[PDB]
C-alpha cells in the first residue's frame, strides 16, 4: 500500500485535495481510503504508480504553499499550480482533433499563465481536467470557450464591462438547454473578453441580453402552453427574431429560429405550431430582404423539417432525423405503399411552396429524404452522391440484418462519412 | 477593488457550477 | 444504375410524373431516386428493364407534349395515354376471371377512346393502374364501374342529368362503408350513364335520392343510438323499403333490408333492434304481396340470421358466418350438450315462426346449420348435399387442427365449390 | 349411414323426435343431420347400429301414434312408450349402488306402467334418460323423486291436495340451490303423494309451506345482508326453527340450521354472523330440551364447523372442509408452529363449553380434526382409528407430493372409506 | 277437470325444467 | 360549357379520391 | 404407537398438558393424536423416545399433582416442576454462548428456587422453553429479563412498589415495538426488582414512567406525521430527553434519542424531521455539557446516520445501513462519479461541524463509510485497519457476485469479527 | 394478600404474553 499524510491544513484546502486525488486514482484504476480531523487529512491507495505519486506529491505541496500565508510559498504554489496546468494543457493537445480546440486550449494555457490568482487558475484547472475525460470534442468548446471566458473577463486590469458582460453570458449559459446556444453566447462572449474595443463590448452586452429576451420568452411560452399568453409570446420571439434581423448581429437570429423550432416540434398541430411556421416564413423573408445567407438558408431548413414532421406525424409512422450546415435529411421507415404515393405528394406540395432543391430516394421499405440550398450545381451533385449513398448503406445494412438501434447508430457514422467526404 | 474580487469569485463560481453542467450528462 | 432528365416540366405534371414511374419501379421491384427543381426532374433508378425503361419514357413523353400548350403535341398525347390505357387493359384480360368484369373493361377501353379530356384518360388510366394492383375483383367491379361511370357522364354533349347523377352516386360512394351499397349504386348510375332515355334517368335519380335518405337515416339511428329519435329513424328506414317495393326498384330495398340487418346486428338485445326485427317482417309481407323473390326472400334470411345470433349471443360462443343469393350459413362449435338441445329446439322454434326450409347438422362438437328459400326441390337436395359436405370438410380441418381463420376461408373456398359443382 | 324419413308430422311432435334422436346419436358417438318444413321431418345419421336404429324407429313409431286422433293408436304409443319406459328402467338398474335408488327406479317404472298420461310417459322417460347421463347417484335421487312425484300426483283419480303439494314442492326444488333441502323436500312431497291420509297432506302442505318461510327468509337475510332488516331476519329464521322444534320436526330443523350456517359461512366475522351463532346455541339448546337427537347433534356440529372455520380465518390459513352423518372433519395446512398451538388451545376453547367428543391430530404440516357425538364409546373409538388414519393418508400423500385437487379427492375416497370400514 | 288438468301440466313442465336444471348443475 | 368543365372536373376528382378509396383496402 | 392416558383432569390442567406436549413432539420430529372430554384427556405420539415418554410422564405427574387439593402433592409438583427448570436451565447453560446471558439464567433458576409459585414456575418453565428454541442470544436476554423481573417481583412479601414497577414495564414492554428500549427498560426494573432500596424503586419508577412518556409522544408524532401537534411533540420529546440529562438518568437519555431518530429516518426530508436534527445537535451540546460521553458520542453518532441517509435519499442509490457500539458504518454500492465527488464533499461539510473521527473508502464502484469517537487513537488505527478491511471484504463479496442480503449477513460477521478481534 | 396475589397473576399472564410477543417474531 502507498500513504499520504498532510497536516495543518485548513477545511477548504482539504474539501480540495481529496477530490483531486480520488480522480487520479480513478484514472490509475486503484481503490482508495480518506480520512479526516479538523486541520490533518490522511489517504492510503492500493500500489499507486510512482508517476500518479509523483503528480499527487506535487498537488500535495501546492495545495499546502497555496494555503501558506508567505507570499513566496504563494509565489511557489503559482508556478507549481501553472506547471501542473500546462503539463495537462499538454496532455490535452494529442487527445484533441479540432484544430479551433487546439487554439482555445493553448489560449487557454496562455491566460492562465498571465493570471495573478490562484482561484482562476484552479478553475482553469478543473476545465482542463474535465476536458481530458469529456467524450465530446463540442463539450470541450464549451469546457474551453468558458475556460477562456472565465480567464480572459478575470484579469486584473478588466473592466467592469467585461465582468458583467461574462456574467450575463455565463448565467445564459447555466440556464440554456440546448448546446448550440451556449456556444453562441459563449463564443460572443470569448470575443469580447479577448478584446477592448467597447463598441465590442457594448454590442456583445445588447446581444447577449436579446438572447436572454429569447430564452426568457421561450421558458415562458413553454412553461405557459395551451394559452392567449403563450400564443402572444409567438409573436414577441419571432418580433425580437426581426429585430435581430433589423438590426444585422444575427447570430443571436440563429438562435431565435431554432427557440422557434423547438416550440413547434414540441407541441404538433397546435394554434402555436401553426402561429410558429407563419412566422418562420416571415423570419425566412426578412433573411432574405437582409441577404443574411446561413441565416435565411437555416430559415428554410427548419420550415421544411417540420412539413416532413407534420408528414410523418400525419401517417403516423416511425422517422429518423439528423442535421448539418446547410442541409437537412429526414429518413422514413415501413411506409405503406399508399402512404409512399401520399409522402412524396407532401413533399413536392412543401416544395412547391419553399423553393428548395429536394432530393428523394426509395429503396427497399426506407425512404431517404435529403434538402440542401445555397450550394452550387456540383456541391448539390455531390450531395446527390451521398443520399443514395445513405439510402444504399442503410437499406443493405438492415438487409445483412441490422437492427434498429445499429441502423439508429450507423445514421451518426453516415453523418460522420458526410464530413468526411466534404 | 472589492466589487471586482467578488464579481470574479462570482465568475469563478459560475464557471465551476457551467463544468459540472457540461460534465454531468455525460 | 439507369437516369433520365426533363425540362421546363410544371408542378402538377411533374406530380403526375413521380407517381406513375414510382408505380412503375415498385412493379419492377426496382430503388428509385427523384429529385425536384421549380421547372426540372432527374429520375434513376437501380438497372432498369428495357421494356419499362421504354414504358417510362413513352409516359414522360406523352406527359411533356400534354402539358404543351400546342394541339397537336396533344393531339400526340391523346394517342400515347390511349396507347398505354389501351396496352394496361389488355393486361387486365387475362388477369381477370368474371366475364362481367371482362366486358366492364372491354367497354371501358371502349369509352376512354371516344374521349376528348386528358383528365378522362387519366382517371381511366389511374382506375386500371388500381385494377392491375387489386388482389380483389370485387374491388376491380367497383373500379371498373367508378371508371365506366366517369368516362360515360364525362362525354361531350352529355345531358347535365347525367352529371348530376353521378355526382349524386359518386358523393354517395365517398360517404359510404358498405361495398355492395356501392355496388348497387353505381351499377344503377352505370346503367342510367349508358342509356339515353329520361325516364331511366329519373327513376335512378329518385333511386339514388332514396339509397342516400336510407344511408343518411343509418348515420342518424347509429350516432344517437340508444333514443326515440333513433327509434322514429327505424320507422322511416322501415316505411322507405315499403316505398321502395311499392315503386318495385328492387335494388333500393335490397340496400334497405341490409341497413336495418346492420343496426339490427351492432345493437344486440336493444329496443331499436327489437323495432328492426319486426320491421323486417312486414317488409318480408310487403315484399311476398309484390313477387321480387331475391328481396322477398332475402327479408326472410335477414331475419333467420338475427334469430340465430340472438340465440348464439345467448349461449356466448364466437361462430362462423358466411353468405349466398337464395341461401345463410352458420357454424358454432364447443356447445354445451344442453345447448345442443337448445340450439335445436330454437331453430325448430324459429322455423314454426318463420317458414324457412332449413338443414342443422352435428359431428364432434361442430353444429353447421343452413337455411334456404325459394330453390326447387332438386337445388334443395343438393344445397342438403353440400351442407352434409361442409360439416364433413369443417370436421376433417379440425382433424388437421385448424383454427377458425382457416375455416372462414374454406367456407369460401366451399362457396366456390357449391357454385362450380352445379 | 341410414336415413329416416317421416310425413305428415305436428310441429311439437317433430321437436320430440329431434331431442330423443340427438341423444341417442351422441349416445352412440356419432354425427347426423336433420332437415325441417311444415308438415315433415327427415334424419340421416353416420355408422347407425341396428339396435339404435329400432330404437329410433319404435320412437318414430311412438310419435305418430301419440299424434294420431285415435284411441287404439294412442294405446300403441301407451304400449311402445312404456316399453322404452320398461327397457331404460332396467337399463338403470345395474348403473346403480344404492338400493333406495333401485326402488324409487322400481316404483317409477310401476307408476308409469299404471299411468294413463303420455305427457307423465314421455317426461318420465327424460327422467330415466337423464339418470342414464348422471354421474352422481345423489342427483339421480333427485331426479327420481322428481319423476316419482309427478307420476304419483298426477293420477286420474287423485285428490287436488295432492297437485297443490307437488307443486308447492317443485317450486321449491327450482328456487333452491341447495341439494340436501330439495331431497328433504322431495322426499316429504313423495311420501304425501304415497299417503291415502289426509293427515299426512295436511303435514307435508304446512311443512312445506314453514321450508318455503325459511327459504323465502334466507333470500331476505342474503340479499339485504349487512341491514337491520337482515338483522331482524336473522331472529325470525331463528324462530321458525324454534316453531319447528315446537312442532317435535327435526327434518325443517335440519334446513333452518343449515339456511344460517350459509349465512353465517358466506357472511364472516359480521354482527349478521354474531346473531346467528348465539342463536345456533339457542337452537341447540332447544333442541337438547325437546329431545331432537339427529338435529341436536347438526346444530352442535355446525357450531364447532363454524368456530373452526373462524379461527382458521382469523389465522388466514388454507383448510380443508369436507362432511359426513353424525360427525364433522377439518384439515388445516401450513399452519406455523405458533398458531399450531394457537389453534389446538382454541378447540379447547370451543370444547370447554360445546362438551362434543373431540380428537385433534397432527403430522407434518397438516392437522387432522374430527369431531362427533352420541356414538357409543366403540363407534368413537373406530373414529379415533380413522381420523390417525386420514391424517397418516394425508400428509404421506402430501410426502408423496399430491397437490391441492389432489388431496381434495383424497377427502371424497376416505370420506367413502370410512362408511366402506362399517 | 280444468284446474287439475292444468297443474298436471304445469307440474309435467316444471319436472321438465327441474330435469334440465338437475342435469345441468351435476 | 363552364358549369359542365366543373362538375366534370369534380366528378373526375371524386373519381381518383374514390379509386384511391377502394385501391386502400385489399 | 406410544399412547398416554389421564383421568379427572381439569380443564385449565387439559390445556397445561397439551402445549407443551406438543412441543416436545415437535422436537423430537414425532406425529401425535390428542382427544378431550371433560375431566379425561388421551395422547398417542409415533414411537416417542423412552427420555421424552419420561418428561411426559412428569409433566403429566406434576400437572396432576398440581391440581390435587393435598398440599403434600403440590409440593411434590413444585419438586417436579423445579427438577425440570434446573434441566432445562442446565441445557440453556451449555447451549447458549453470552456471558451475562450466562448469569441471568443461573439467576433465574436460583429465583425459582426460592419460590412459593406453581404459576411462577410455569411462565419460568415457558421462559425457558422459549429461549431453547430462540435463535437470538438478545432474545435469549430479552426472555431471560422478562422471566427474573417476574420472579423478582413475585417473591413472597414483596413491597408493591416492586410489583408496580414490574407491571408498569411489561405494560411497557407489550405497548413497544423497539427492542432495545425494551432491554434497557427491563433491565432498569430488573436492576430496581434485585434492589431494595426505596430511592432507587422511586428513580426507576420515574425513569419507567418518562419512558412511557416518550413512547407516547412517539406514538403521538408517528400517527399523527405532518400536524402541527407532531411538529409541538418533536418539542416535547426533546424537552423531556434536556429533563433526562439534567436528571442524569442515562439509559432513558439514551432511548430519548433513538427516539427522535426513528421519527427523522421514518419522515425523511419533512419539517418534522427538521425540526429532530436541531434537538439531536440541542440534546448533544446538552450532553457534552454534561458529560454524558457515551450518549453524547451516542447523539453525535445519530446526527452523521440521518445527514449520510438523507444526501444519500438526494443521490437515490441503494445503500447497506448497519450500526455497532461507539461507531456506524454505511456503504454505498454502483455510486455515479458525480456523486461520489459530491459525497466526498458532503461528507467532509457534515465533519466540519460535528467535530468527528471519520474514514471514507473506494474500491470498484462501492463506497464504506466509517465513523467513530471518543476512542484512543491505536483504537482509531484499528478502526482504519477495519474499514479499510470491510472495503477488502466487500470488495472481495461482489466479486463473488453476492446479493446486499449477503452483504448485510457479511457485516455482521465483519462486526462479530471487530469484537472478537478486540 | 388478595390484591398482591392479583397483581402477580397480572404480571404472569403479561409476562407469558411478553414471550409470546418475543418468540413469534423469529
Same mark, same amino acid.
Given at each position: 500500500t502507498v500513504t499520504f499524510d498532510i497536516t495543518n491544513i485548513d477545511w477548504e484546502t482539504a474539501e480540495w485535495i481529496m477530490k483531486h486525488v480520488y480522480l487520479i486514482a480513478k484514472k490509475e484504476g486503484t481503490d482508495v481510503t480518506f480520512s479526516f480531523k479538523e486541520g490533518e487529512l490522511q =489517504?492510503?491507495?492500493?500500489?499507486? !504508480? +510512482?508517476? /500518479?505519486?509523483?503528480?499527487?506529491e506535487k498537488w500535495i505541496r501546492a495545495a499546502q504553499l497555496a494555503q501558506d500565508?508567505?507570499? +513566496? &510559498?504563494?509565489?511557489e504554489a503559482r508556478k507549481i499550480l501553472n506547471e501542473l496546468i500546462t503539463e495537462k494543457a499538454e496532455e490535452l493537445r494529442e487527445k484533441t482533433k479540432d484544430e479551433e480546440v487546439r487554439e482555445l486550449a493553448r489560449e487557454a494555457a496562455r491566460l492562465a499563465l498571465e493570471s495573478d490568482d490562484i482561484e482562476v487558475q484552479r #478553475?482553469?484547472?478543473?476545465?482542463?481536467? /474535465?476536458?481530458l475525460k469529456s467524450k465530446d470534442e463540442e463539450v470541450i468548446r464549451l469546457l474551453l470557450?468558458?475556460?477562456?471566458?472565465?480567464? @480572459?473577463?478575470?484579469?486584473?486590469? &478588466?473592466?467592469?464591462?467585461?465582468?458583467? =458582460? @461574462?456574467?450575463?453570458?455565463? +448565467?445564459?449559459?447555466?440556464?440554456?438547454?440546448?448546446?448550440?446556444? =451556449?456556444?453562441?453566447?459563449?463564443?460572443?462572449?470569448?470575443?469580447?473578453?479577448? &478584446?477592448?474595443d467597447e463598441e465590442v463590448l457594448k454590442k456583445v452586452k445588447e446581444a447577449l441580453e436579446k438572447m436572454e429576451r429569447i430564452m426568457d420568452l421561450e421558458d415562458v411560452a413553454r412553461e405557459k402552453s395551451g394559452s392567449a399568453e403563450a400564443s402572444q409570446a409567438v409573436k414577441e420571439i419571432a418580433d425580437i427574431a426581426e429585430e435581430a434581423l433589423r438590426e444585422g448581429l444575427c447570430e443571436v437570429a440563429r438562435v431565435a429560429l431554432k427557440r422557434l423550432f423547438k416550440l413547434a416540434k414540441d407541441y404538433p398541430g397546435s394554434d402555436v405550431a401553426s402561429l410558429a411556421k407563419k412566422a418562420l416564413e416571415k423570419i425566412a423573408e426578412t433573411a432574405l430582404r437582409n441577404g443574411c445567407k446561413e441565416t435565411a438558408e437555416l430559415?428554410?431548413?427548419?420550415?421544411?423539417?417540420?412539413?416532413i414532421i407534420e408528414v410523418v406525424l400525419k401517417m403516423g409512422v416511425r422517422m429518423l432525423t439528423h442535421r448539418g450546415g446547410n442541409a437537412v435529411i429526414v429518413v422514413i421507415?415501413?411506409? !405503406?405503399?399508399?402512404?409512399?404515393?401520399?409522402?412524396?405528394?407532401?413533399?413536392?406540395?412543401? @416544395?412547391?411552396?419553399?423553393?428548395?432543391?429536394?432530393t428523394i430516394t426509395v429503396?427497399?421499405?426506407?425512404?431517404? =429524404?435529403?434538402? #440542401? #440550398?445555397?450550394?452550387?450545381?456540383?456541391?448539390? +451533385?455531390?450531395?446527390?452522391?451521398?443520399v443514395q449513398e445513405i439510402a444504399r448503406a442503410l437499406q443493405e445494412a438492415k438487409r445483412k440484418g441490422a437492427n434498429e438501434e445499429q441502423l439508429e447508430q450507423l445514421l451518426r457514422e453516415l453523418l460522420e462519412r458526410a464530413e468526411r467526404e466534404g | 477593488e472589492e466589487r471586482k474580487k467578488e464579481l470574479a469569485k462570482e465568475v469563478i463560481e459560475t464557471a465551476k457550477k457551467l463544468i459540472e453542467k457540461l460534465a454531468k450528462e455525460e
Open positions: =489517504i492510503t491507495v492500493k500500489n499507486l !504508480h +510512482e508517476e /500518479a505519486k509523483r503528480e499527487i500565508p508567505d507570499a +513566496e &510559498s504563494k509565489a #478553475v482553469v484547472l478543473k476545465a482542463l481536467l /474535465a476536458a470557450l468558458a475556460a477562456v471566458l472565465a480567464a @480572459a473577463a478575470a484579469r486584473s486590469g &478588466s473592466p467592469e464591462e467585461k465582468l458583467e =458582460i @461574462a456574467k450575463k453570458a455565463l +448565467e445564459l449559459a447555466m440556464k440554456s438547454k440546448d448546446e448550440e446556444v =451556449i456556444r453562441l453566447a459563449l463564443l460572443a462572449a470569448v470575443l469580447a473578453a479577448r &478584446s477592448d430559415a428554410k431548413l427548419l420550415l421544411f423539417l417540420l412539413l421507415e415501413g411506409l !405503406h405503399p399508399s402512404q409512399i404515393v401520399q409522402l412524396m405528394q407532401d413533399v413536392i406540395k412543401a @416544395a412547391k411552396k419553399l423553393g428548395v432543391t429536394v429503396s427497399g421499405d426506407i425512404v431517404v =429524404i435529403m434538402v #440542401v #440550398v445555397g450550394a452550387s450545381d456540383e456541391e448539390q +451533385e455531390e450531395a446527390r452522391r451521398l | -
